[PDB]
Amino acid sequence: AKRLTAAGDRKQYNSIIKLINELVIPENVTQLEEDETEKNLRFLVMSLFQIFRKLFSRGDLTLPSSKKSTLEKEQFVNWCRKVYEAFKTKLLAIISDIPFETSLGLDSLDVYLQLAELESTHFASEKGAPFFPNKTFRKLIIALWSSNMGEIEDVKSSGASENLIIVEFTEKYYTKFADIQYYFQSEFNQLLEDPAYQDLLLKNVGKWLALVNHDKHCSSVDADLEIFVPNPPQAIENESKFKSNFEKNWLSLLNGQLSLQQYKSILLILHKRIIPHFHTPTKLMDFLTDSYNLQSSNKNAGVVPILALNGLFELMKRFNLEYPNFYMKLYQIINPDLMHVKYRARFFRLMDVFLSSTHLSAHLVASFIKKLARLTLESPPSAIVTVIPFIYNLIRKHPNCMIMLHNPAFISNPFQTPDQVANLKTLKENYVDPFDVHESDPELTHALDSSLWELASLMEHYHPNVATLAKIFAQPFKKLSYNMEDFLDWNYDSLLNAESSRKLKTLPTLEFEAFTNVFD
Amino acid sequence: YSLNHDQPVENVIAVSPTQIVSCGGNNFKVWDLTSNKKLYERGNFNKAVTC
């Protein structure tokens, strides 16, 4: 209370290093008991927080004056007392972290950050080691992980988990400098040895996903983090050891106990948040091809081959080793599910490189574009917009496949004999298209003799931009290509945001006079 | 007379008047013209053999 604040100010203004330690121990016992009592029961509106604020300022001044070091003549009271007081206050802050069913913005964060900064200053001031608070980072991450959620445990809408203390920690301490993430990732591996707590510490991984997956690391040059407290245990410049322990702890957590949403997200951004930061990112390839051959009839587990393709292509670009019989698998993988997935753009931004090959056949590209035409029969306009320039690019730079879209044996040309045009008539009477959709091999099906009616019928469409991007086959091929990665990130809300305004002068009357027939 | 490598053939060379060597996919197949028949095939690769 206010009397505790006055006693703390008096015991900090006077040194008196017996009764000051006794009054600090009494106020610390009162602070721990009031924390366990008014922890969201009679919710502590800055009461224990103000007590810990006064105790943190007093312990900061006392640590700047005299802390546990080499003694004058065996100071078995003051140095041990300040050490026990600091340890008990940090353990009480960790206890308030581990027992917190609510969060009024200061349930554990202020006390934990104050004790962490005070431990860093105490290590760098006593100078007996270099960042020796990383041993207490074990119980720190144990508390900030065991700060369990009531109902926000891996919500099925966004992210992979929603833990306020973990996201505020990775905002305010874990990514404001550079070495404590390295020491955390090593001490996570030195944590995960006995099964007793790691059976809980491998339960729900999405909190660590939101904790580490931020693209702010030291091995990533996009945002380099600055210098920590001035006692270096060669920590930031040991990126190689950082990469190896990163790889080891990542494989140990990825071994078991997946949730489906966290599995989907970690497969969605495995290619960039995980792959380039390893010491030897080859230990993930069989996991990635198991995700690629993961074909269940479950409707959620069908996005799994789509998210695996980026990591698999990163692997094959890094060093050539294959998944065999590639293109009939890539043939069978696309369907209206794949066209109505959220990741049309993220799929086509790898489909263009996978289909820009030199060795593939006219048979393969013919089967691809005709089954894709039967696919784009049934699509939204945001799928027509992304599917038409890719197929135009492929039919342009594989110009033998124009035999589908054009046939010169069936032209209504004037200058030939009535015998020849009657032979044209009986040929267009007895002609049969040999296509079949259910054949899954591209070169074995008959897609060449079967023409492409589907985009010709897709010209007739209720959107003039789809009309002007669908008459490109009736018009000639004077234009080279269209900019897929500057063309493809368009959803329905972005499309309406695009044509909410334009060169705007549009008005027309309503003279239908068709009201009193069926007005519903 | 035609000879059908089941994979799309990538290279056709001749090593003799009798037998030729054609490759497509992850195996190369030796054909003989006098027997008009495939008689060897080795597939000790990963991806398609290209020359």
């Binding site: 990825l254 071994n255 230990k283 993930l284 390839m285 069989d286 080793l321 | 000790n44 690769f45 990963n46």
Partner: peptide
């Protein structure tokens, strides 16, 4: 869902090919 282990053996398979 696969429930065996995620670690690397088809690299050994097509490195033994």
């Amino acid at each position: 869902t696969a429930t065996t282990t995620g670690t690397v053996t088809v690299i050994l398979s097509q490195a033994l090919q």
